[PDB]
Write a protein that binds this ligand. Structure first.
Ligand code: ATP
Ligand code: ATP
Ligand code: MG
Ligand code: MG
Lengths: 563, 559
């Protein structure tokens, strides 16, 4: 249970203490009310049945206290469950943008999706559904055993022996189904990820005939998931059998001690008849724990995924801010060295981009120019060296002011599901309609509005899938151009655009009135027509540098690249 | 829909109902025997006549619980096998629907359909009929026995029963609409989470955590969950308190102790209520908590059956080689929103056809129609004479290969993304395809060579994964090849090399090339200019330049 307490808000721990105290009180009251029947029937069946009034009053008092404590425990469990839900989910939402990009491996992405997928009512009502009944059933027969010591010491000792057998059975059942349940959870997560891939990559899978279950990866994942689930069901058989045997042993001990006491005359016949009912109350939690115990492993795995997401290593985040108010910063790399894992992408790349001017980065594929744009934008950080925005290290910049200092057109434009206008407004949600219209006109998104039926309210699919490649590229360009940031990083913005739209978009990127330091990556020479300076990035090195005309006349790698 | 989906589970569920009736009778069995034995004891009967029956009844306690545990362990197997077959059927159906379904629905909704909706049927199979039969049998049987035993205390037993029924009814009415709205919120939240994880660069650069729509949907969904579960959990807890064995025992004693103290009830006549009267509360609580599960399962079954009843890409019975013919083809992604307007085109072997035009003109949807991702609204498409609506998927996709505009790698090795069409292809074939696509040199630099995984985050550059998709299409080695905006992210050297490789590999094949860089399609035998979903001019490069139409303007704009 230490994993659950670790996720509770620090401001909500008094509620946890109250909930624990009220749970113990509820168990104690239930046990006392169960055992108070023995004096009640002893007096009721006596020669003067008026003596049962006192025990009836005590039973009524304990019953009303039990109702009050149980309503309060339910309230506190609901509050704690939804508070844990809100804090964990909001902390994951706040942290994941700050989590390092390398952390998002497919396994880690699956873990993050599963943790977010636990937002439903299963984990929200965890305390009322699992912890409260589990604790109540686990401590009820122990409390009944303690309560019976006031009636008869050996009877209570037999009840506590049955409780010890119950706890041993619980531990063994938990241990037996551990590996099977872990493998079942792993296979279920893999199946979920493969379903998501199956829906996303449907075109390629169909074209490759890897779509039927007999041939698809999702089908193999379904087979593995079914196998692991059936192994889990099989390995829960010994747990259920052991719980049943523990119940039988507890009943044997309780009933044998009760019958022995009755035979010896130390326990009246009405008291034994009351002990039949107390035995029934005592044996009920044996089934309840058996039914609830399987859910511990799933709950434990869910909380483990949530905590693992919350433990992800975030990027460094200083508190510097750019001194000048909105002016174009001077971008520069100083001995910047970068590597995705063991592959060295950049090694010794040094340059200084002037403020307000437009720069172009060009070179072969895999040269490391999208990596340069990502380092400028703060998506990545150098392994060594410093990226400076206006002389301020980007690592030390405030993250809130770091993202406000750069806007990026990514190589693979991604649009969120929703209307077309919503995606453009991601650049600046509170921008005026004139600014949005200007951004759309510059990016030539306005040519979609008169052609598409629903205009800018047309619903885009997952990604930009309900729009053509050029259309979603123009939407991404408009999104980047709406943001007022003084640095614009253009990454292959003209890849999917025809010559007319490509020329218009390029001229709009140059003719954007906002003062910006512009860095452009392209594989067509017409995309960098207005670039003041060119960087030739090849194998992680700016081998050639200068103006377009100067490098063309010099006959360096620029002309050979465009030859 | 739900009944038609769960028809295979007719007799297992009927058997579960009958077995649970027998099991609940067995649960009530030892208490009746102990009531009779205690009546004989307090009547002065000899203990010699009661030892055997007494031990029998005491050992019988909890036998029905063990039998119910065994029945639930069996019905869990039944449910797991049924869910496996159901998910197989779902994956089979999704493999044949048009891709308009996928695009309009999303991937989170597909995930919900396959996983959660089938998992939502768990209570409806494993517990619903047992709980219903138990709550109809054990409460009614116990109440009949207690009413024939003593009506006076049976009447006060009826009070919490009616209170529980009222609580169950009002809870069901209150939370019925919330349960209906619940799966829609679940799939919306799943889609927002998937977009938050997938679109992480967009989230980081533009707005961050605070401004993300993911947080807004998260807060709205948590508000929905709070509003749904606060009254629901309150009613659940009140129903638990009403029907608890402590409450029944207390009510029994409140009604009996005044009767016993007075000369109205014999104390020996309270034994049926003490022994049996407390046992049927949990049986009622089972259905009370299960009615929500029944609603969830029925809604999920209706959704599953609705998806399983949908129209698909059926294969007709109508029933030169290497030739693809579009014959008056028209297509509309939505009703009354055409994207293709009567396109007639014939792709012949040994020739390269270039499909050019403005962005959004309909080149990619035309290539998809050749793939039969969607059915042509009018006209026909025929490969090797056979209409593609008559070819099976295996027959069709063995004839036509595709390089899609969006390079979609699968979670797996670089040797698996290559040779996705032919997974049993040898590693030397994969190496040759990679060399043809110029991605073998890149793969050699990877840490573990050709086994390097390409999941989320462990990606490559855009041009490199585009080359991987080109290698996939090369290794497929189909009679017809379609290149939907291939080499868009390729640099001029890489673009030229892969173009030369494709020209070498498709000298005698039918090639359809879609491109925006018009200088790469100057040698196409037949250039086709598609504007606004209809072909506006067809010819060679020089003829289209001389015509002074749309191609001339596009060529001038790109220089
Ligand atoms: N997520 C990643 N994980 C590992 N390696 C990566 C990742 N993204 C890129 N790389 C590698 O980084 C190197 C440079 O990648 P980058 O994205 O900078 O390419 P690029 O120069 O923009 O190429 P292109 O012109 O093809 O778009 C390549 O070797 C690529 O394999
Ligand atoms: N899944 C879809 N659902 C609805 N409309 C779609 C879908 N895919 C494409 N469209 C619409 O189809 C029209 C043509 O798009 P398409 O992708 O066929 O053009 P294209 O010639 O390939 O474009 P590009 O040069 O941008 O790649 C566009 O208006 C686009 O909005
Ligand atoms: Mg790149
Ligand atoms: Mg396209």
């Amino acid at each position: 249970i230490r994993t659950l307490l670790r996720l509770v808000p620090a401001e909500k721990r008094g509620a946890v203490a109250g909930y624990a105290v009220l749970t113990l009180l509820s168990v104690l009251l239930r046990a006392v009310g169960a055992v108070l029947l023995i004096p009640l029937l002893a007096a009721l069946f006596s020669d003067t049945p008026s003596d049962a009034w006192l025990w009836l009053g005590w039973l009524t008092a304990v019953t009303l206290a039990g109702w009050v404590t149980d309503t309060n425990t339910a309230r506190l469990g609901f509050d704690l469950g939804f508070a844990v839900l809100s804090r964990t989910q909001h902390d994951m939402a706040d942290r994941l943008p700050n989590v390092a990009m390398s952390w998002f491996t497919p396994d880690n992405t699956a873990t993050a999706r599963q943790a977010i997928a636990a937002t439903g009512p299963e984990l929200a009502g965890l305390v009322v559904n699992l912890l409260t009944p589990l604790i109540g059933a686990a401590l009820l027969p122990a409390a009944i055993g303690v309560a019976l010591l006031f009636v008869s010491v050996p009877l209570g000792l037999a009840a506590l022996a049955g409780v010890a057998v119950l706890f041993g059975a619980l531990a063994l059942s938990g241990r037996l189904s551990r590996a099977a349940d872990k493998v079942a959870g792993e296979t279920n997560s893999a199946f979920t990820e493969r379903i998501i891939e199956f829906a996303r990559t449907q075109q390629a899978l169909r074209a490759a005939r890897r779509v039927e279950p007999a041939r698809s990866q999702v089908g193999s994942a379904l087979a593995a998931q079914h196998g692991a689930g059936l192994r889990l069901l099989t390995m829960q058989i010994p747990g259920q059998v052991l719980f049943s045997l523990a119940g039988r042993v507890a009943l044997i001990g309780f009933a044998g001690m009760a019958v022995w006491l009755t035979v010896r005359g130390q326990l009246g016949v009405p008291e034994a008849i009351a002990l039949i009912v107390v035995l029934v109350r005592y044996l009920e939690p044996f089934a309840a724990i058996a039914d609830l115990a399987p859910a511990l492993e799933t709950t434990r795995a869910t909380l483990n995924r949530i905590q693992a997401v919350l433990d992800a290593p975030t990027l460094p985040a200083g508190r510097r801010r750019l001194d000048r108010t909105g002016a174009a910063p001077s971008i520069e790399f100083d001995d910047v060295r970068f590597s995705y894992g063991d592959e060295v992408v950049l090694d010794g790349v040094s340059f200084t981009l002037r403020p307000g001017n437009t720069t172009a980065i060009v070179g072969p594929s895999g040269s490391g120019k999208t990596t340069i744009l990502s380092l400028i934008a703060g998506l990545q950080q150098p392994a060594s060296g410093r990226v400076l925005l206006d002389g301020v290290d980007v690592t030390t910049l405030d993250p809130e002011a770091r993202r406000a200092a750069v806007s990026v057109v990514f190589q693979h434009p991604y649009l969120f599901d929703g209307t077309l206008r919503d995606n453009v407004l991601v650049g600046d949600p509170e921008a005026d309609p004139d600014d949005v219209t200007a951004a759309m006109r510059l990016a030539r998104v306005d040519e979609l509005l008169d052609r598409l039926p629903d205009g800018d309210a047309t619903v885009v699919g997952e990604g930009g899938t309900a729009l053509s490649g050029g259309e979603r590229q123009r939407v991404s360009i408009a999104r980047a151009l709406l943001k007022p940031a003084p640095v614009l990083l253009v990454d292959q913005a003209t890849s999917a655009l025809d010559n007319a739209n490509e020329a218009a978009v390029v001229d709009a990127l140059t003719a954007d009135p906002r003062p910006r330091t512009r860095v452009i990556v392209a594989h067509r020479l017409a995309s960098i027509r207005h670039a003041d300076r060119v960087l030739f990035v090849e194998a992680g090195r700016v081998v050639e540098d200068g103006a377009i005309d100067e490098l063309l006349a010099a006959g360096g790698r620029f002309a050979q690249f465009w030859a | 829909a739900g009944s038609r989906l769960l028809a295979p589970l007719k007799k297992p569920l009927i058997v579960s109902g009958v077995l649970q009736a027998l099991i609940t009778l067995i649960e009530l069995a030892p208490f009746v025997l102990l009531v009779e034995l205690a009546r004989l004891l307090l009547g002065g009967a000899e203990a010699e006549r009661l030892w055997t029956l007494g031990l029998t009844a005491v050992s019988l306690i909890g036998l029905g619980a063990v039998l119910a545990a065994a029945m639930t362990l069996w019905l869990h197997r039944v449910d797991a096998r049924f869910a496996h077959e159901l998910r197989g059927r779902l994956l089979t159906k999704l493999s044949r629907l048009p891709l308009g379904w996928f695009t309009r629905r999303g991937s989170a909704s597909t995930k919900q359909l396959v996983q959660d909706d089938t998992l939502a049927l768990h209570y409806l199979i494993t517990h619903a009929i047992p709980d219903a039969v138990a709550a109809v049998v054990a409460p009614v049987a116990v109440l009949v026995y207690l009413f024939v035993a003593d009506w006076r205390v049976a009447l006060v037993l009826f009070i919490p029963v009616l209170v529980y029924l009222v609580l169950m009814s009002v809870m069901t009415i209150q939370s019925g609409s919330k349960i209906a709205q619940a799966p829609r919120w679940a799939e919306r939240m799943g889609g927002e989470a998937g977009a938050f994880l997938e679109g992480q660069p967009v989230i980081r650069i533009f707005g961050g955590a605070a401004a993300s729509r993911f947080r807004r949907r998260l807060d709205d969904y948590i508000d929905f969950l709070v509003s749904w579960q606060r009254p629901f959990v309150g009613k659940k807890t009140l129903m638990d308190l009403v029907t608890r064995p402590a409450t029944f025992l207390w009510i029994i004693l409140v009604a009996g102790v005044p009767l016993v103290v007075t000369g109205r009830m014999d104390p020996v006549n309270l034994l049926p209520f003490l022994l049996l009267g407390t046992t049927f509360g949990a049986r009622l609580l089972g259905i009370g908590y299960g009615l929500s599960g029944i609603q969830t399962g029925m809604l999920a079954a209706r959704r599953i059956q609705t998806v399983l009843d949908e129209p698909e890409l059926v294969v007709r019975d109508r029933t030169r080689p290497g030739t693809v013919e579009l014959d008056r083809v028209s297509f509309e992604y939505r009703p009354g929103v055409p994207v293709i307007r009567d396109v007639t085109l014939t792709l012949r072997p040994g020739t390269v056809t270039a499909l050019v035009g403005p962005s959004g003109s309909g080149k990619s949807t035309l290539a998809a129609l050749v793939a039969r991702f969607h059915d042509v609204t009018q006209g026909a498409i025929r490969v090797d004479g056979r209409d593609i609506r008559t070819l099976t998927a295996d027959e069709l996709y063995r004839r036509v290969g595709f390089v899609l505009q969006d390079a979609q790698l699968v979670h797996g090795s670089v040797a698996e993304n290559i040779a996705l069409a032919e997974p049993d292809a040898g590693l030397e074939r994969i190496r040759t395809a990679a060399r043809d696509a110029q991605i073998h040199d890149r793969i050699t630099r990877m840490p573990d060579g050709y086994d390097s995984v390409l999941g989320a985050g462990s990606a490559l550059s855009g041009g490199e994964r585009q080359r991987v998709t080109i290698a996939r299409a090369i290794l497929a080695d189909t009679p017809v090849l379609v290149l939907d905006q291939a080499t868009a992210f390729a640099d001029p050297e890489s673009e030229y090399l892969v173009q030369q490789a494709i020209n070498r590999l498709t000298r005698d094949r039918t090639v359809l090339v879609i491109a925006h860089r018009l200088h790469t399609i100057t040698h196409a035998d037949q250039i086709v200019v598609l504007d606004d979903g209809r072909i506006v001019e067809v010819g060679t490069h020089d003829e289209l330049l001389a015509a002074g139409g749309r191609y001339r303007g596009l060529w001038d704009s790109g220089r």
